[PDB]
Design a protein around this ligand. Structure first.
Ligand SMILES: CCCCC/C=C/C/C=C\C/C=C/C/C=C/CCCC(=O)O[C@H](COC(=O)CCCCCCCCCCCCCCCCC)COP(=O)(O)O[C@@H]1[C@H](O)[C@H](O)[C@@H](OP(=O)(O)O)[C@H](OP(=O)(O)O)[C@H]1O
Ligand SMILES: CCCCC/C=C/C/C=C\C/C=C/C/C=C/CCCC(=O)O[C@H](COC(=O)CCCCCCCCCCCCCCCCC)COP(=O)(O)O[C@@H]1[C@H](O)[C@H](O)[C@@H](OP(=O)(O)O)[C@H](OP(=O)(O)O)[C@H]1O
Ligand SMILES: CCCCC/C=C/C/C=C\C/C=C/C/C=C\CCCC(=O)O[C@H](COC(=O)CCCCCCCCCCCCCCCCC)COP(=O)(O)O[C@@H]1[C@H](O)[C@H](O)[C@@H](OP(=O)(O)O)[C@H](OP(=O)(O)O)[C@H]1O
Ligand SMILES: CCCCCCCCCCCCCCCCCC(=O)OC[C@H](COP(=O)(O)OC[C@H](N)C(=O)O)OC(=O)CCCCCCCCCCCCCCCCC
Ligand SMILES: CCCCCCCCCCCCCCCCCC(=O)OC[C@H](COP(=O)(O)OC[C@H](N)C(=O)O)OC(=O)CCCCCCCCCCCCCCCCC
Ligand SMILES: CCCCCCCCCCCCCCCC(=O)OC[C@H](COP(=O)(O)OCCN)OC(=O)CCCCCCCCCCCCCCC
Ligand SMILES: *[C@@H]1O[C@H](CO)[C@@H](O)[C@H](O)[C@H]1NC(C)=O
Ligand SMILES: [K+]
Ligand SMILES: [K+]
Ligand SMILES: [K+]
Ligand SMILES: [K+]
Lengths: 321, 607, 304, 321
């Protein structure tokens, strides 16, 4: 088989035969930030290093054209003082663009073209400085890494709650900080064929969770049990305990989206429960206690379940009794 | 004496820019680096962003592409451009080694031009695959800058009385031409494929084929280089090892050569009787404009074949002469210029030039093979359609018997149209053999004089011998087949019935004359075998005789100076590349008469 | 493949097979010496058997005679092993069980008795002889470069490794292409055989358009197999030529350096370069015969 | 005709006869970032270049008033050392404001006014540096360019699904990264006249899509089919196949809004399907397949449709049978 979403939230889909490369070229910045860190470091390094080299040749060339490279006598004021070779020009380019300015190699007022290049390099230097420094901070401050500290259960549980079967799972937050405006979306991913004969390979049917005022809103500070009540209009209304084997083509996806309180950027944590990762005769064990004047959450027992008496019939059969 | 772009002579007086900057040789050479760094700084950000950024989960494969107008010309010019720059780098290094200091301006600008020229090809190909005609402006700017900055250097040579005697003057002149023509090509695509200036971006007109028709034979669609290296097949073979191939992975045939489009032109040419003479006129008209292309590649490959021995002759003479004295004897502006004669004097230069000469030769002969074969099987499909059409409708009032002869028709499309196809496989080979032979013997005569004439004559006289034993070998199999058929017929009387023949226990005496029926065929095998063994030592051992009749003849009847290693190996190399193109000459003559019978057989059976 | 080819030496025996190995190896070694003495003689020409160097010619005179006898030594023995294979199969055929014959299709035996033996008789000894000289000449060509410069062999081995991978990916693909070309050959001529008989049952009854267009399906399937087989060969040769051409440049550059690094060499260098040019040409020939020997390798499988 | 929204999401509306230019003047920063790139480069260049010139005249003037420009003798400590002409003053302004500081031209402690200008230039130099560099990064990191990699179908489909006619379309995401909190809004744009006689030239009627838990929420990692079920209260309840010609005045708009996971800025992808761009008797072909242990999406067959048996009657007539 294959997993639509990995247990860690990675999506196992490969996009193939794209014939619209122009769209990717028209969207450059998103490409720049989406690069892996070794490529981001290379681009960050090569952006400044090539910029210094490009103007280093310009500084070297105009010093050549002005006769500054020739050591013949003196009495001539160079475009840039103390420039002898390309290495001097390259060092001067670094001083100007990074705004170090040692002053041993200084621009003089003899060559208006040199003053023109000094204006151009500073303007170009600022734009490269602005984009690249901002780009690498966006790369660092991405909110998807915050999703690594949002943990779901390794197993999902279907059991009787208030007389109806409920597909339950537990989601917790390890960090002290909060997830502002957290929303939970649960979907069923399987191949469904309509009566007209249309087949959808990964038809994602959105299932609701019981919240009391609708859904898609939680206050995640202690590990919550997120459960969906299986009723007449639920896609799992005809799910039997015999169906919960490895090769079933039945996947449940849980999505947790919210604004990271520490950073301010919305994140997304995903997980998936295959058919064999759902336990029928089980129930989660409480892990919240009260020590002194502060509730203590025991994350060691996060995913533990305890068998409970549950009917081996489908939710359809339960209504029919 | 550290690294210096302009070299450290006098008091670095070569860096002075008085009397004009453009009159300073180094500055103009430094000015020529501007276009090359421009191309690198433009294409690399573009190539990385659109092509080298997303990977391993985002596939942007284009299984459809249209070549820009002038695609073939652009690749030809770049290959010439790449070759000339290699000469310019080699020319610069020879001039630089004489001085005590290293003048980087002699070769580094040309060396960096080599990277930019390659990058332009890489940049163009990726753009061309994914359209993006607007991005061709970067090349358009690059060619204009390169043309401007190379014109300046060429003009300043003319001002400084630098004639054609100096090689660097010639190489710079060619680059102006090559940059100029490439500039025109970029202008050409703007006219044909208006995309920037005109307000009507003319329709790309996507190819009729190359859609999702299952075409896997991408040879007529890939770029020019991939046509000469078959790089498209590399991916196909890379997976053929993992999975066995089938008639589905092999795909469908391209539209231009399926079967019908070959026959459609065949019957069109037939419009002009339908005799043997009339058949050849149609085939020449239908499949001649492509056949000459294969011969032309073969001719050029044959011409570059002599570049092997010539480089061998050149390298040894300038290596065994010792001396090791190198002096350009031509110094302008304090810079040494090497003459054309002196440039083709260094062993390293000859070795590099030989390496480039082989690559063009090896590719050309391979290109000659495929075009002939592709055209050969194109005729085979058209001929089979004509043969089948002859048997089928439009053949009213069949003469008599069982459609003339059932057996004759079966082999007519089995082992008679193949001979016609194999004639076109070797059609350039017969044409290109005399050209290689006449130049080969002439070059031998200019190396070893009289002794080479005798050695070449006996090899030429071997060609009738090879055909003579070919007729004997062919006749031996013909006599063998008469006895083998009787042996097969006698054996195939209860062999298929051996499931029930063995039950009667009559096979004990049946398998007693098998040796007799085989010895009557083995004695014909002996006649066939001895002819084969005769051709072996008449082919494998004949180069040894050719060498001896040329070597010992230098004093037996020539009486000349002692032979040098250069003249000996050059003639040995010429003999080696001449003996091998002789077996095909006997084969093509045998194939020529065989095909002539087959086409006559088809012509007489056409009506 | 070729693992079962360790057998079949019984037909060639021991004395006969060893004679071919001794003779074939001798011819290449002498030719190496013949060219070597030519280089030394030419080197000695420009300045002790320096007198008219007829000894080297005498050594060259025996080589062709030794090559002449080698041509028939490997050819005469090939005829006898065909006789022994013919004799061995005949004894098995007579003693073949009838019940096994009834169970088997009994048609493959007839094809193996006639078609396979015919290939073994007139083709296999020639192909094996051509393979032996090609696979030995390249090794000899890979030693003259070592003698002229022991420095070239440092990078020669990695190039041969790349040649091994290219060859390994070609024989697999080419043989499968050969099967498909053989597969598509049958329907094309069989349809013509079905065309000559019952044509009046096709012309009068049917429009004949379907039958003619049905052939175009056969021809297209045949043509694609042909050019794909051709393209694989052209793909093989080109990568083989580029390896050979690269070998020449490495050999030439190293040989030139030694002469200019006070390592003498002199005219001896020019000898290796002529062999280096032949390395590419013989490299294609060796691979060509190796694929052909696979048919021979499978030929004994039908007999084994 | 005219299109309310182009196929690429461009809105074809021109605002005319605006007599409230004071509102645009009161909102300057949004104007600054909304400029096209050639204007943004000009403003970015002219903001620094004019700043250097403005203080260059000030540095030149106070050096004039102090007598520094006069080469008469020495023994006088200038306001700024080594200032001779306006070019020297202009170079000094660049050194101070870009914080290069070569040191050949250095502020001295003789002129308190010169020290005052040095304080003023640095404070002004920082504000211009802060606003302009931040402005050009916002211009680069705009989220609208991310919408260029959110492809929609070139044709919509109205087929039979589960016994009811459904207006279907396919939306996909080319990038590997996700669109967090993706929402889909579909609207019908046509001229509707109320019974009272009021006419609305572009009355945008919002239509719902079937999601199962309400709507306006998708998990877009694989190309989804977004469809609206045509029922009694739907605006297309009286749509006939004869009405799907070019000149019909019936436009469907699809809006996809979500936070870009890579960047963190909400984006918006728009598309429109005119009457002739909607195919009646069609159905999208599945493109999602399973290769090894990873689903493969074949974007070559993205917009392809296959004819299916569909009634040629309106959804109103379907209920009436
Ligand atoms: C006597 C001598 C003594 C010598 C002693 C030696 C002395 C050695 C001297 C100095 C250097 C040691 C410096 C110490 C520096 C720390 C830098 C701090 C900034 C920094 O953060 O850099 C770090 C460290 O790497 C570097 O150092 C990269 C730093 C940039 C390198 C720029 C070099 C410029 C190259 C120019 C050279 C060529 C110039 C040519 C010159 C000629 C031109 C004419 C980058 O590391 P990282 O942790 O951010 O990246 C990982 C990694 O890339 C993973 O692939 C990535 O996985 P994914 O993103 O999920 O795919 C991880 O992501 P997760 O967070 O999810 O796990 C990242 O966390
Ligand atoms: C011997 C000598 C040798 C000489 C050799 C030559 C040597 C030449 C020397 C040095 C320069 C070459 C520098 C190489 C630089 C790259 C800069 C990198 C920063 C950068 O990103 O700049 C780039 C390149 O343009 C520039 O270069 C613009 C750079 C800023 C220019 C500032 C110049 C300052 C003017 C002051 C002069 C006047 C001063 C007066 C002085 C006297 C005062 C007293 C801007 O290009 P872009 O790609 O961002 O802009 C496009 C374009 O604008 C399209 O219109 C836009 O369409 P929409 O936005 O949709 O409307 C595209 O948007 P999409 O993304 O959707 O497609 C943009 O992508
Ligand atoms: C003295 C020597 C001077 C050497 C330096 C030269 C300094 C001089 C400086 C700059 C000028 C030389 C400029 C090159 C000139 C002309 C290019 C004009 C072509 C152009 O417009 O560029 C874009 C690509 O966008 C980029 O990637 C553009 C990306 C930026 C391009 C410039 C790269 C900037 C970084 C380079 C500097 C690197 C510095 C360090 C890196 C800094 C990083 C911040 C065209 O490409 P496209 O793919 O967008 O257009 C296609 C194509 O045209 C289709 O036919 C068309 O139809 P459909 O595909 O069916 O829809 C579509 O057209 P649309 O674009 O309208 O949708 C697009 O699909
Ligand atoms: C002395 C010798 C003198 C003469 C020498 C002549 C050598 C000429 C070599 C020129 C090679 C350029 C050929 C075009 C390369 C090119 O286009 O690469 C492009 C390739 C990707 O392939 P694709 O077909 O686009 O793939 C389809 C895929 N679906 C896609 O669109 O993606 O992916 C790439 O982008 C690959 C880039 C590789 C660039 C390598 C350049 C050459 C390197 C140096 C070798 C030559 C110099 C040797 C000196 C000795
Ligand atoms: C490494 C060396 C690279 C060498 C590249 C050689 C390429 C082989 C040539 C080759 O295969 O051409 C074959 C092509 C294909 O014709 P077609 O099917 O009719 O297609 C065009 C279209 N249908 C039309 O005719 O409309 O035929 C054509 O379309 C025309 C081909 C013309 C080829 C001319 C070759 C000259 C090369 C000169 C190079 C000299 C310098 C080389 C130095 C570098 C060496 C490394
Ligand atoms: C370098 C490899 C880059 C590459 O693989 O280039 C890929 C292209 C393939 O040809 P194509 O784009 O026409 O095929 C259509 C694909 N859409 O170019 C070539 O292979 C030209 C041949 C490369 C030269 C190699 C010669 C030495 C080895
Ligand atoms: C400079 O070098 C040149 C050699 O090209 C020669 O005229 C002399 O050695 C030097 N002349 C002067 C004036 O320095
Ligand atoms: K300083
Ligand atoms: K600073
Ligand atoms: K500073
Ligand atoms: K200082």
């Amino acid at each position: 088989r294959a997993r639509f979403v990995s247990k860690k939230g990675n999506c196992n889909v490969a996009h193939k035969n794209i014939r619209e490369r122009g769209r990717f070229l028209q969207d450059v910045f998103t490409t720049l930030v989406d690069l892996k860190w070794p490529h981001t470091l290379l681009i960050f390094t090569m952006s400044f290093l090539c910029s210094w080299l490009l103007f280093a040749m310009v500084w070297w060339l105009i010093a050549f054209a002005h006769g500054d490279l020739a050591p013949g006598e003196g009495t001539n004021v160079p475009c840039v003082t103390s420039i002898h070779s390309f290495s001097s020009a390259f060092l001067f380019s670094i001083e100007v663009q990074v705004t170090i300015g040692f002053g041993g190699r200084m621009v003089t007022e003899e060559c208006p073209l040199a003053i023109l290049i000094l204006i151009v390099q500073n303007i170009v230097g600022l734009m490269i400085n602005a984009i690249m420094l901002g780009c690498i901070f966006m790369k660092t401050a991405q909110a998807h890494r915050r999703a690594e500290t949002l943990i779901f259960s390794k197993h999902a549980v279907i059991t009787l709650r208030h007389g109806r079967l409920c597909f339950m799972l537990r989601v917790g937050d390890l960090r002290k900080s909060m997830i502002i405006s957290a929303t939970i979306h649960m979907q069923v991913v399987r191949k469904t064929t309509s009566p007209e004969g249309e087949v959808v390979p990964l038809h994602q049917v959105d299932i609701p969770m019981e919240n009391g005022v609708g859904g898609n809103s939680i206050f995640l500070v202690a590990p919550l049990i997120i459960y969906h009540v299986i009723d007449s209009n639920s896609p799992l209304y005809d799910l039997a305990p015999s169906d919960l084997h490895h090769h079933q083509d039945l996947e449940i996806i849980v999505i947790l989206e919210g604004v990271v309180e520490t950073t301010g950027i919305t994140t997304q944590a995903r997980t998936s429960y295959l058919a064999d990762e759902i336990l029928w005769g089980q129930r989660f064990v409480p892990i919240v206690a009260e020590e002194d004047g502060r509730y203590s959450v025991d994350y060691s027992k996060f995913g533990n379940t305890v068998k409970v008496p549950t009917p081996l019939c489908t939710a359809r059969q339960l209504d029919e009794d | 004496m550290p690294l210096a772009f302009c070299g450290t002579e006098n008091h670095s007086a070569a860096y002075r820019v008085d009397q004009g900057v453009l009159n300073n040789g180094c500055f103009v050479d430094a000015l020529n680096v501007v276009p090359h760094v421009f191309l690198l700084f433009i294409t690399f950000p573009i190539l990385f962003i659109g092509w080298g950024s997303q990977s391993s989960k985002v596939h942007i494969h284009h299984s459809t592409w249209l070549h820009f107008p002038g695609h073939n010309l652009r690749w030809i010019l770049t290959f010439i451009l790449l070759f000339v720059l290699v000469c310019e780098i080699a020319e610069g290094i020879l001039s630089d080694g004489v001085t005590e200091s290293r003048h980087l301006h002699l070769y580094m600008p040309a060396g960096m031009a080599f990277m930019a020229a390659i990058t332009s090809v890489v940049y163009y190909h990726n753009i061309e695959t994914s359209n993006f005609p607007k991005l061709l402006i970067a090349l358009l700017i690059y060619w204009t800058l390169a043309f401007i900055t190379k014109t300046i250097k060429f003009v300043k040579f003319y001002d400084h009385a630098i004639g054609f005697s100096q090689l660097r003057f010639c190489l710079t002149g060619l680059l102006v031409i090559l940059y100029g023509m490439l500039l025109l090509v970029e202008v050409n695509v703007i006219r044909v494929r208006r995309y920037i200036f005109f307000k009507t971006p003319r329709e790309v007109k996507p190819p009729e084929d190359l859609q999702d028709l299952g075409v896997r034979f991408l040879q007529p669609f890939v770029n020019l280089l991939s046509k000469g290296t078959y790089w498209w097949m590399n991916a196909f073979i890379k997976t053929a090892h993992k999975k066995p191939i089938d008639l589905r992975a092999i795909g469908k045939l391209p539209i231009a050569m399926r079967a019908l489009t070959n026959y459609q032109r065949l019957c069109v040419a037939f419009d002009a009787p339908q005799g043997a003479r009339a058949i050849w006129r149609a085939l020449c008209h239908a499949f001649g404009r492509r056949l000459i292309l294969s011969s032309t590649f073969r001719i050029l490959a044959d011409l570059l074949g002599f570049a092997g021995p010539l480089c061998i002759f050149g390298i040894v003479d300038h290596l065994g002469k010792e001396n090791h004295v190198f002096q350009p004897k031509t110094q302008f502006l304090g810079v040494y210029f090497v003459s054309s004669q002196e440039f083709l004097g260094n062993a390293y230069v000859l070795a590099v030039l030989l390496f480039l000469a082989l690559l063009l030769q090896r590719t050309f002969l391979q290109a000659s093979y495929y075009v002939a074969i592709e055209t050969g099987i194109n005729l085979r499909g058209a001929i089979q359609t004509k043969i089948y059409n002859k048997i089928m409708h439009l053949s009213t009032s069949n003469l008599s018997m069982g459609e003339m002869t059932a057996g004759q028709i079966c082999n007519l499309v089995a082992i008679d149209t193949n001979q016609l196809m194999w004639f076109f496989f070797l059609c350039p080979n017969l044409w290109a053999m005399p050209v290689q032979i006449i130049v080969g013997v002439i070059l031998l005569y200019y190396i070893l004089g009289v002794s080479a004439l005798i050695g070449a004559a006996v090899i030429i006289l071997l060609a009738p011998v090879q055909y003579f034993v070919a007729t004997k070998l062919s006749q031996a199999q013909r006599s063998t087949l008469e006895h083998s058929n009787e042996r097969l017929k006698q054996t195939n009387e209860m062999l298929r019935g051996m499931k029930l023949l063995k039950l009667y226990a009559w096979e004990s005496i049946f398998c007693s004359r098998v040796e007799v029926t085989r010895r009557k065929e083995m004695t014909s095998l002996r006649a066939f075998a001895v002819y084969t063994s005769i051709s072996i030592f008449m082919n494998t051992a004949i180069p040894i005789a050719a060498v001896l009749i040329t070597f010992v003849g230098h004093v037996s009847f020539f009486k000349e100076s002692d032979l040098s290693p250069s003249v000996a190996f050059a003639s040995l190399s010429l003999f080696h590349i001449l003996v091998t193109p002789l077996f095909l000459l006997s084969s093509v003559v045998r194939s020529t008469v065989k095909a002539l019978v087959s086409v006559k057989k088809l012509s007489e059976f056409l009506s | 493949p070729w693992r079962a080819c360790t057998k079949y030496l019984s037909s060639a025996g021991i004395l006969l097979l060893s004679l071919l190995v001794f003779s074939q190896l001798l011819k290449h070694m002498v030719l190496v010496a013949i060219d070597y003495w030519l280089a030394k003689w030419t080197d000695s020409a420009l300045v002790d058997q320096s007198v008219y160097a007829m000894v080297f010619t005498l050594l060259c005179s025996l080589g062709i005679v030794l090559c002449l006898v080698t041509s028939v030594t490997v050819e005469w023995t090939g005829l006898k092993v065909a006789k022994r294979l013919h004799r061995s199969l005949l004894n098995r055929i007579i003693l073949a069980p009838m019940r096994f014959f009834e169970t088997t299709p009994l048609g493959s035996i007839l094809n193996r008795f006639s078609s396979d033996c015919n290939t073994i008789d007139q083709h296999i000894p020639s192909t094996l002889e051509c393979l032996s000289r090609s696979t030995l000449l390249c090794v000899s060509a890979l030693t003259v470069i070592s003698y002229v410069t022991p420095v070239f062999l440092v990078a020669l081995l990695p190039l041969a490794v790349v040649c091994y991978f290219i060859q390994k990916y070609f024989r697999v693909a080419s043989r499968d292409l050969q099967q498909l070309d053989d597969t598509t050959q049958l329907p094309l001529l069989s349809h013509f055989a079905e065309t000559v008989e019952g044509l009046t049952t096709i012309r009068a009854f049917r429009y004949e358009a379907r039958f003619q267009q049905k052939l175009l399906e056969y021809t297209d399937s045949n043509n694609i197999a042909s050019l794909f087989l051709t393209a694989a060969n052209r793909w093989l040769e080109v990568r083989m030529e580029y390896i050979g051409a690269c070998v020449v440049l490495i050999a030439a550059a190293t040989s030139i350096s030694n002469s200019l690094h006070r390592e003498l060499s002199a005219g001896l260098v020019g000898l290796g370069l002529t062999y280096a040019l032949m390395v590419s040409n013989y490299l294609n020939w060796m691979v060509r015969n190796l694929a052909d020997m696979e048919i021979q390798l499978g030929a004994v499988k039908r007999i084994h």
